[PDB]
UniProtKB/Swiss-Prot annotation, chain B:
Glycans are attached at N41. It comes from Severe acute respiratory syndrome coronavirus 2 (2019-nCoV). Binds to host ACE2. RBD also interacts with the N-linked glycan on 'Asn-90' of ACE2. Cleavage of S generates a polybasic C-terminal sequence on S1 that binds to host Neuropilin-1 (NRP1) and Neuropilin-2 (NRP2) receptors. Interacts with host integrin alpha-5/beta-1 (ITGA5:ITGB1) and with ACE2 in complex with integrin alpha-5/beta-1 (ITGA5:ITGB1). May interact via cytoplasmic c-terminus with M protein. May interact (via N-terminus) with host bilirubin and biliverdin, thereby preventing antibody binding to the SARS-CoV-2 spike NTD via an allosteric mechanism. The chain holds residues 563 to 612 of 1273 of the full protein. Attaches the virion to the cell membrane by interacting with host receptor, initiating the infection. The major receptor is host ACE2. When S2/S2' has been cleaved, binding to the receptor triggers direct fusion at the cell membrane. When S2/S2' has not been cleaved, binding to the receptor results in internalization of the virus by endocytosis using host TFRC and GRM2 and leading to fusion of the virion membrane with the host endosomal membrane. Alternatively, may use NRP1/NRP2 and integrin as entry receptors. This is Spike protein S1.
Length: 50, 50
């Protein structure tokens, strides 16, 4: 019963959270550590053989 | 400068002593060869994949 009495507030908060996370995924440059680390490990392991 | 090099410590550009223009070095087209076939009990034809 609490959802239908605050549907507009929940929708606005969801849109605000989506916008904030879209801004934060590009603002922070260290938020993509794992994929960059594993591709750098693959590149280094390929380069050290040569 | 006599000849060049790259990141992978391989010869890339070679300058001949006869003429001042420089020549790049790129190795021959190498790659694995793969076979695409169905079961031998079904058919006999094969496909060659490079
Ligand atoms: C010397 O090098 C030049 C480069 O163009 C060539 O034309 C000439 O025939 C060469 N002569 C000798 C001494 O081999």
């Amino acid at each position: 019963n609490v959802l239908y009495e605050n549907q507009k507030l929940i929708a606005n908060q969801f849109n605000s959270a989506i916008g904030k996370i879209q801004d934060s995924l590009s603002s922070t440059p260290s938020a993509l550590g794992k994929l960059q680390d594993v591709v750098n490990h693959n590149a280094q392991a390929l380069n050290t053989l040569v | 400068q006599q000849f060049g090099r790259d990141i992978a410590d391989t010869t890339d550009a070679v300058r001949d002593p006869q003429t001042l223009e420089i020549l790049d070095i790129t190795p021959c087209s190498f790659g694995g060869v793969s076979v695409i076939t169905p079961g031998t009990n079904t058919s006999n034809q094969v496909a060659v994949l490079y």
